[PDB]
Scaffold this active site. Structure first.
Site, mmCIF file in Angstrom:
data_model
loop_
_atom_site.group_PDB
_atom_site.id
_atom_site.type_symbol
_atom_site.label_atom_id
_atom_site.label_comp_id
_atom_site.label_asym_id
_atom_site.label_seq_id
_atom_site.Cartn_x
_atom_site.Cartn_y
_atom_site.Cartn_z
ATOM 1 N N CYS B 14 12.860 29.452 101.561
ATOM 2 C CA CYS B 14 13.579 28.604 100.594
ATOM 3 C C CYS B 14 15.075 28.565 100.946
ATOM 4 O O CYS B 14 15.781 27.778 100.323
ATOM 5 C CB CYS B 14 13.318 29.091 99.169
ATOM 6 S SG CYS B 14 14.463 30.388 98.652
ATOM 7 N N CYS B 17 18.323 33.362 101.461
ATOM 8 C CA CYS B 17 18.965 34.480 102.194
ATOM 9 C C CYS B 17 20.205 33.943 102.921
ATOM 10 O O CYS B 17 21.257 34.610 102.878
ATOM 11 C CB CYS B 17 17.986 35.164 103.117
ATOM 12 S SG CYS B 17 16.489 35.778 102.276
ATOM 13 N N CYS B 112 10.612 37.233 102.060
ATOM 14 C CA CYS B 112 9.736 36.373 102.903
ATOM 15 C C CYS B 112 9.478 37.078 104.236
ATOM 16 O O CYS B 112 8.316 37.296 104.582
ATOM 17 C CB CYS B 112 10.343 35.012 103.224
ATOM 18 S SG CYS B 112 10.308 33.813 101.864
ATOM 19 N N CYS B 146 14.947 38.746 96.867
ATOM 20 C CA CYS B 146 14.725 37.293 96.799
ATOM 21 C C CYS B 146 15.896 36.624 96.088
ATOM 22 O O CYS B 146 15.794 36.254 94.920
ATOM 23 C CB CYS B 146 13.401 37.002 96.112
ATOM 24 S SG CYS B 146 12.923 35.275 96.321
ATOM 25 N N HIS B 184 16.505 51.380 87.794
ATOM 26 C CA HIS B 184 16.457 52.158 86.527
ATOM 27 C C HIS B 184 17.323 53.428 86.610
ATOM 28 O O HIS B 184 17.682 53.944 85.547
ATOM 29 C CB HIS B 184 14.984 52.435 86.203
ATOM 30 C CG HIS B 184 14.715 53.160 84.929
ATOM 31 N ND1 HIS B 184 14.798 52.555 83.691
ATOM 32 C CD2 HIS B 184 14.279 54.417 84.707
ATOM 33 C CE1 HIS B 184 14.457 53.425 82.758
ATOM 34 N NE2 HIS B 184 14.134 54.576 83.356
ATOM 35 N N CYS B 187 21.013 51.934 86.020
ATOM 36 C CA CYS B 187 21.087 50.783 85.085
ATOM 37 C C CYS B 187 21.934 51.180 83.871
ATOM 38 O O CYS B 187 21.632 52.210 83.258
ATOM 39 C CB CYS B 187 19.709 50.357 84.615
ATOM 40 S SG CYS B 187 19.785 48.981 83.445
ATOM 41 N N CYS B 212 17.621 48.170 75.964
ATOM 42 C CA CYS B 212 16.792 48.215 77.190
ATOM 43 C C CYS B 212 15.747 47.087 77.169
ATOM 44 O O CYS B 212 15.219 46.763 76.090
ATOM 45 C CB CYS B 212 16.154 49.588 77.328
ATOM 46 S SG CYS B 212 14.922 49.680 78.645
ATOM 47 N N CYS B 218 10.822 44.442 82.054
ATOM 48 C CA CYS B 218 11.741 44.913 83.118
ATOM 49 C C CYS B 218 10.997 45.816 84.113
ATOM 50 O O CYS B 218 10.414 46.824 83.693
ATOM 51 C CB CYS B 218 12.934 45.658 82.544
ATOM 52 S SG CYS B 218 14.135 46.100 83.824
ATOM 53 N N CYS B 227 21.228 46.657 92.867
ATOM 54 C CA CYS B 227 21.683 45.677 91.849
ATOM 55 C C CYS B 227 22.428 46.344 90.692
ATOM 56 O O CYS B 227 23.330 45.705 90.150
ATOM 57 C CB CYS B 227 20.514 44.879 91.301
ATOM 58 S SG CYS B 227 19.561 44.104 92.629
ATOM 59 N N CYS B 239 20.672 40.893 86.964
ATOM 60 C CA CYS B 239 19.643 40.311 86.071
ATOM 61 C C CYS B 239 19.749 40.934 84.675
ATOM 62 O O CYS B 239 19.860 40.202 83.682
ATOM 63 C CB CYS B 239 18.273 40.527 86.687
ATOM 64 S SG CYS B 239 18.167 39.748 88.316
ATOM 65 N N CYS B 246 14.590 42.958 85.225
ATOM 66 C CA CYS B 246 14.263 42.940 86.664
ATOM 67 C C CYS B 246 12.823 42.425 86.815
ATOM 68 O O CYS B 246 11.945 42.892 86.063
ATOM 69 C CB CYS B 246 14.452 44.340 87.234
ATOM 70 S SG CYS B 246 13.965 44.543 88.965
ATOM 71 N N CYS B 249 12.033 41.969 92.479
ATOM 72 C CA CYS B 249 12.010 40.966 93.578
ATOM 73 C C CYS B 249 12.222 41.590 94.969
ATOM 74 O O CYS B 249 11.982 40.889 95.957
ATOM 75 C CB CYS B 249 12.981 39.813 93.323
ATOM 76 S SG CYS B 249 14.731 40.139 93.686
HETATM 77 S S1 SF4 Z 1 16.813 47.488 81.329
HETATM 78 FE FE1 SF4 Z 1 15.179 47.943 82.933
HETATM 79 S S2 SF4 Z 1 16.199 49.178 84.592
HETATM 80 FE FE2 SF4 Z 1 17.615 49.147 82.729
HETATM 81 S S3 SF4 Z 1 17.134 51.038 81.594
HETATM 82 FE FE3 SF4 Z 1 15.786 49.433 80.726
HETATM 83 S S4 SF4 Z 1 13.802 49.461 81.964
HETATM 84 FE FE4 SF4 Z 1 15.411 50.669 83.085
HETATM 85 S S1 SF4 Z 2 14.918 41.070 90.032
HETATM 86 FE FE1 SF4 Z 2 15.505 43.302 90.123
HETATM 87 S S2 SF4 Z 2 15.673 43.734 92.324
HETATM 88 FE FE2 SF4 Z 2 15.683 41.447 92.120
HETATM 89 S S3 SF4 Z 2 17.883 40.873 91.955
HETATM 90 FE FE3 SF4 Z 2 17.200 41.185 89.815
HETATM 91 S S4 SF4 Z 2 17.634 43.384 89.327
HETATM 92 FE FE4 SF4 Z 2 17.776 43.147 91.584
HETATM 93 O O LIG Z 3 13.600 35.025 101.442
#
Ligand code: SF4
Ligand code: SF4
Ligand SMILES: [O]
Ligand SMILES: [Cl-]
Ligand SMILES: [Cl-]
Ligand SMILES: [Cl-]
Ligand SMILES: [Cl-]
Ligand SMILES: [Cl-]
Ligand SMILES: [Mg+2]
Lengths: 598, 267
Positions: B14, B17, B112, B146, B184, B187, B212, B218, B227, B239, B246, B249
C-alpha cells in the site's frame, strides 16, 4: 484501428512499452503506438497488481472493515477508512455527532493537502523540471524570479538559492545520482529556464521537510500517520478541556490550528504560485496536450457539505457532465443500479456475463489472469500486451455506460458549472479558476516579458496543465476549509457539546439482520465509493470503486477508453524511447495503482 | 567514500512504509537520501521509468556486488503464476530473487515484507508470501508494523550505515533496539489498567479520563513496538493516546486474531 469518443485509435505504428511506470503509487505498465511523426495514436493502461481486499473482507465484522480497507493505500491514507465507516453508518442508520463530523472533515482536508503537495513536488515535478539545468542557474536571477512568482515567500535570497544549488552540485559531482540516475535531463521536452528549475528543486526540498509537519493533525485525532484510526459511530479522540488526560484538549486543538496556519502559507506562497508559473511557461511553449475525457465527461459524488448530511450544501458540489456541456450537471446517485457499474470485459476477472456492468452492491471479484492470442511473449514474460483481450487488474467503471474522468480537475469543472448555474457554495473554486486564468494568460506573462494569451477556462482546464492546476487549487481550498472547520469545532466544544461517538448501534445485537450501505468520499484522486451488504452481523459483500479505477480503467464491453488512455492520445513525443510526455500526462492524474486494484 | 547503494523494491503493498520513511524528523529523509545512502532504485521517487529504471539494477549490482542493501516494501504473490504483481512484464518474485542474490543485507520493511500483512489475511487470494519464505540464503532484518514508526525505519538505516552491521535481532528477526518492549510495558494508561479502570463504551466518562482500552480490544499486551515511548510523527501521539486500542499491527498475522474490538482473554 477504430473510432471511439471522438478518438481515432490506430495500433499500426511503432509500439513503445513503459514498465515500470515510476513516480506513481504501486504498479502500472503503459504501452503506446506512435505514428511516423512520433505522435501517440493508441494508448494501453495496464494495472500490474492485485491483492483482493474485497475477497478478504467477506465474513468479517463491519466495525473492523475500516482498518482492512485503509490498507488499500498508504498514500491516500484514511480516505478508505472514511468511506468504510460512512458505508457502515449508512447501512445501520447511524448519525455521528457534530464534533466527529468536523474532525473527519479536518482529517480529510489534511490528507488532500499532504497528498496533493507531495504528489506535485516529489512525483510530478521531475516531468516539468530538469534538475541538471538547475545547476546552470544564476542564484541572483533565481532570487528575482522567486520574488516575481511569489513576493510573500520569505525564502528568496540569492545566498539561499546558491547554498541549495551547491548541495545539488556536490550530490551530482559525487557520481551517485540516486533518484536522478538515468533521468531524461536535457530532453527538448523540458522548456523551463535554469532559474525556474533551481526555484522548483529548492521547493522540492522545502516540501519534503514540511510535509511531515502537516500530518501531525492526523496524529492528534487518529494516533499516527500513515494509517490514522477511525471508528464506526464517530471518532476515538474523546474531548476533555478541564483534561490533559483526554485525547483532545485545548492545547491539542491549538497545536492543530498552528499546523493548519502553516498549510495555508505553503499553499498560497509555494505550491499554487509554482504551478501557475510552470503552467504559464509550458502554455507559452504550446504544450496543451492531455485533455482526454476532461473535454467531455467528468464525474464526482460531491463532498464537504457546510451542513452535515445536507448534500445541497456541498462546497465541492458534484454530479456528471457529458459531451463538454458545462450548462447541464446531471445528479449522480451511488444507490442507483443503472448509474455506477463496473465491466471486466478487458480486465483479469470473470463474470457470468461480461457483456454487462455490475453495480457494486451486485459486484463480483473472481480473478481470471489470461492473455490474448495477439500477446507477444508468454504468460510470465510479456513483451507486448494484447489490449484486444484482458489486459489489466483494474475493472472498468462507467456511469450510465459513459466513460468519465474523475479527480480534482473533474471537481473544479463541476464547481465552475455549478457556480455558473447560481450555486453559491462553489464561489471560492470559481474565484480561484478566474484568478488562475488571469495569472496564466496576462499577469505572469507580463512579469516575465512574454506575450499575453486569451485562453478561456473551457480551453485551459481540459489539458495536462489544467489537471495539474486544479490539484494545486484544490489543495489551497481544502486548507482554507479546514481552517473554518477548526473554528466551528472549537466553538461547538466551547458551547458545551463534547460528544465524539454515537454508540447506540455499536453492539450488533441492535442491528437489522440484513442491511446495505454506501459511503462516498471526494478522495484526493477523485470519486471513491465503498458498497457493503451486512447479514447476521457479518460482511456479506464489500465492493470498492476507487478514483484510479475510473481513470486507469481498461476498455469496456463497447470498447470505450478510460481517462488515462484518452489523455495520452494525439501527443507528440520528442523521442519515442524517452517517456517524458507519457509520464507528464499520466502523472497529472496522480495514479494510485494499489487504490485502483485493491 | 561512496554512500552505500539502496535498491528499494516494491511488491504487493500500500506504500505506507515509503510514506512513513519520509516522516522521519531525526534523521530527515532528505539527509538520509542526500548524505547517507545512495537511493538508486525506488519506484515512488526515481526519475527514470521503464527500460531506463530497470537498467539501474544491473549497473549497481555489478559495480557494488555484495556491498548494496536490498530494501523490500510489500511481498510477492505465488498465485496467478506470480502475475498478480508484474514488473517489466515478469513476476515480481523474479526481480526480488535477482536483486537479493548479491545484496550485503536485506531489509523487510513493514508487516507486508516481514509477515504478509493485509493481502495475506484469510483467504489470501494471491498467496502473498513474506520475503524470508522466498529468500532463504541471505541475512534479513524484519522491521514490522503497518507501517513501522518513521524513526524506527531511519534508525535501522542509520545503525546499518554507521556500523556496516545488522543490529542484534530477536528470534523473529526484529531489531531488539526497537522491538524489545510490548506496548503495554510503558503505555501511559498502564496505571489505569493496574487499577482496573477501563473504557467500556466509546466516549463514556472513562474514555474522557483516558482510562485503559483493554476492554475495547487493545492488543498492546501482546504487541512488540516502540509506539508507547518513541510514539508517532516526532513523538506527537500513538493509537492509545489518541483513544483507539492497539490493533497489534507489528505482530505476525494480526488481521486473523479476531475482531480488533474483542478484548484479550485472561486479563
Ligand atoms: S491501553 Fe492497551 S497497552 Fe495501554 S495499559 Fe491499557 S491494555 Fe495496556
Ligand atoms: S496498532 Fe499498536 S503496534 Fe501498531 S502503530 Fe498502533 S500502537 Fe503501535
Ligand atoms: O507494509
Ligand atoms: Cl463522515
Ligand atoms: Cl500534480
Ligand atoms: Cl487467475
Ligand atoms: Cl494466458
Ligand atoms: Cl501480518
Ligand atoms: Mg473494486
Amino acid at each position: 484501428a477504430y473510432a471511439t469518443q471522438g478518438f481515432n485509435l490506430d495500433d499500426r505504428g511503432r509500439r513503445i512499452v513503459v514498465d515500470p511506470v515510476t513516480r506513481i503509487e504501486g504498479h502500472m505498465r503503459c504501452e503506446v503506438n506512435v505514428d511516423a511523426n512520433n505522435v501517440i495514436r493508441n494508448a494501453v493502461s495496464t494495472g500490474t497488481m492485485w491483492r483482493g481486499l474485497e475477497v478478504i473482507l467477506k465474513g468479517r465484522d463491519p466495525r473492523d472493515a475500516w482498518a482492512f480497507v485503509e490498507r488499500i493505500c498508504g498514500v491516500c491514507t484514511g480516505c478508505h477508512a472514511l468511506a468504510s465507516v460512512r458505508a457502515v453508518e449508512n447501512a445501520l442508520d447511524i448519525r455521528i455527532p457534530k464534533n466527529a463530523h468536523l474532525i473527519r472533515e479536518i482529517m480529510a482536508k489534511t490528507l488532500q493537502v499532504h497528498d496533493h503537495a507531495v504528489h506535485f513536488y516529489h512525483l510530478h515535478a521531475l516531468d516539468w523540471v530538469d534538475v541538471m539545468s538547475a545547476l546552470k542557474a544564476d542564484p541572483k536571477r533565481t532570487s528575482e524570479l522567486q520574488q516575481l512568482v511569489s513576493p510573500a515567500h520569505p525564502l528568496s535570497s540569492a545566498g539561499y538559492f546558491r547554498d541549495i544549488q551547491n548541495r545539488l552540485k556536490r550530490f551530482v559531482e559525487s557520481g551517485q545520482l540516486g533518484p536522478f540516475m538515468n533521468g531524461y535531463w536535457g530532453s527538448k521536452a523540458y522548456v523551463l529556464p535554469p532559474e525556474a528549475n533551481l526555484m522548483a528543486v529548492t521547493h522540492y526540498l522545502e516540501a519534503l521537510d514540511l510535509q511531515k509537519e502537516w500530518v501531525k493533525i492526523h496524529t492528534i485525532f487518529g494516533g499516527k500517520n500513515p494509517h490514522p484510526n477511525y471508528l464506526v459511530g464517530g471518532v476515538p479522540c474523546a474531548i476533555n478541556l478541564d483534561a490533559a488526560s483526554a485525547p483532545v484538549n485545548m492545547e491539542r486543538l491549538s497545536f492543530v490550528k498552528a499546523r493548519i496556519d502553516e498549510i495555508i502559507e505553503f499553499n498560497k506562497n509555494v505550491y499554487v504560485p509554482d504551478v501557475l508559473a510552470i503552467g504559464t511557461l509550458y502554455k507559452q511553449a504550446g504544450w496543451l496536450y492531455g485533455g482526454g475525457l476532461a473535454a467531455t465527461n467528468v464525474l464526482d459524488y460531491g463532498e464537504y457539505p457546510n451542513v452535515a448530511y445536507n448534500k445541497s450544501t456541498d462546497q465541492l458540489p458534484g454530479g456528471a457532465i457529458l459531451n463538454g456541456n458545462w450548462d447541464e450537471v446531471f445528479p449522480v446517485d451511488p444507490r442507483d443500479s443503472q448509474q455506477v457499474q463496473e465491466f471486466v470485459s478487458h480486465s483479469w476477472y470473470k463474470y457470468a456475463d461480461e457483456s454487462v456492468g455490475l453495480h457494486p452492491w451486485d459486484g463480483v471479484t473472481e480473478p481470471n489472469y489470461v492473455l490474448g492470442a495477439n500477446t507477444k511473449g508468454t504468460r510470465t514474460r510479456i513483451e507486448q500486451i494484447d489490449e484486444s483481450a484482458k489486459y489489466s487488474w483494474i475493472k472498468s467503471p462507467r456511469w450510465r455506460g459513459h466513460a468519465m474522468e474523475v479527480g480534482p480537475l473533474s471537481r473544479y469543472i463541476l464547481a465552475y458549472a455549478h457556480a455558473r448555474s447560481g450555486n453559491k457554495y462553489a464561489e471560492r473554486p470559481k474565484e480561484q479558476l478566474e484568478y488562475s486564468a488571469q495569472m496564466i494568460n496576462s499577469a505572469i506573462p507580463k512579469a516575465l516579458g512574454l506575450p499575453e494569451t486569451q485562453y478561456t477556462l473551457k480551453q485551459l482546464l481540459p489539458s495536462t496543465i489544467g489537471r495539474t492546476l486544479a490539484r494545486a487549487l484544490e489543495s489551497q481550498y481544502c486548507g482554507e476549509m479546514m481552517h473554518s472547520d477548526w473554528h466551528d469545532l472549537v466553538a461547538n466544544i466551547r458551547a458545551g457539546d463534547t460528544a465524539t461517538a454515537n454508540v447506540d448501534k455499536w453492539d450488533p445485537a441492535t442491528w437489522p439482520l440484513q442491511a446495505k450501505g454506501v459511503g462516498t468520499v471526494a478522495a484526493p484522486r477523485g470519486a471513491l465509493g465503498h458498497w457493503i451488504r451486512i447479514k447476521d452481523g457479518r460482511i456479506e459483500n464489500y465492493q470498492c470503486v476507487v478514483p484510479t479505477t475510473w481513470n486507469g480503467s481498461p476498455r469496456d464491453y463497447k470498447g470505450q477508453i478510460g481517462a488515462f488512455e484518452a489523455s495520452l492520445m494525439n501527443t507528440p513525443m520528442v523521442n519515442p524511447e524517452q517517456p517524458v510526455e507519457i509520464l507528464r500526462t499520466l502523472h497529472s492524474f496522480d495514479p494510485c495503482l494499489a487504490c485502483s486494484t485493491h | 567514500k561512496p554512500r552505500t547503494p539502496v535498491l528499494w523494491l516494491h511488491g504487493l503493498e500500500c506504500t505506507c512504509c515509503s510514506e512513513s520513511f519520509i516522516r522521519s524528523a531525526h534523521p530527515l529523509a532528505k539527509d538520509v537520501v542526500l548524505s547517507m545512502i545512495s537511493l538508486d532504485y525506488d519506484d515512488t521517487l526515481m526519475a527514470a521509468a521503464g527500460h531506463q529504471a530497470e537498467a539501474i539494477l544491473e549497473e549497481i549490482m555489478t559495480k557494488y556486488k555484495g556491498n548494496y542493501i536490498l530494501a523490500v516494501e510489500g511481498n510477492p504473490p505465488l498465485n496467478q503464476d506470480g502475475m498478480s504483481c508484474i514488473i517489466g512484464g515478469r513476476p515480481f518474485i523474479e526481480q526480488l530473487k535477482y536483486v537479493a542474490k548479491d545484496a550485503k543485507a536485506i531489509i523487510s520493511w513493514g508487516s507486508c515484507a516481514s509477515w504478509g500483512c493485509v493481502q495475506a489475511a484469510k483467504p489470501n487470494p494471491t498467496q502473498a508470501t513474506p520475503v524470508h519464505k522466498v529468500i532463504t540464503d541471505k541475512p534479513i532484518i524484519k522491521v514490522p508494523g503497518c507501517p513501522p514508526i518513521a524513526e524506527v525505519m531511519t534508525g535501522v538505516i542509520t545503525y546499518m550505515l554507521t556500523f556496516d552491521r545488522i543490529p542484534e535481532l530477536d528470534r523473529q528477526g526484529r531489531p531488539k533496539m526497537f522491538y524489545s518492549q510490548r506496548i503495554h510495558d510503558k503505555c501511559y494508561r498502564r496505571p489505569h489498567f493496574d487499577a482496573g479502570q477501563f473504557v467500556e463504551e466509546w466516549d463514556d466518562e472513562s474514555a474522557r479520563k483516558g482510562f485503559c482500552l483493554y476492554k475495547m480490544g487493545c492488543k498492546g499486551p501482546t504487541t512488540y513496538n516502540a509506539c508507547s515511548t518513541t510514539r508517532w510523527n516526532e513523538g506527537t501521539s500513538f493509537c492509545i493516546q489518541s483513544g483507539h486500542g492497539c490493533i497489534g499491527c507489528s505482530e505476525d498475522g494480526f488481521w486473523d486474531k479476531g475482531s480488533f474490538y474483542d478484548r484479550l482473554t485472561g486479563i
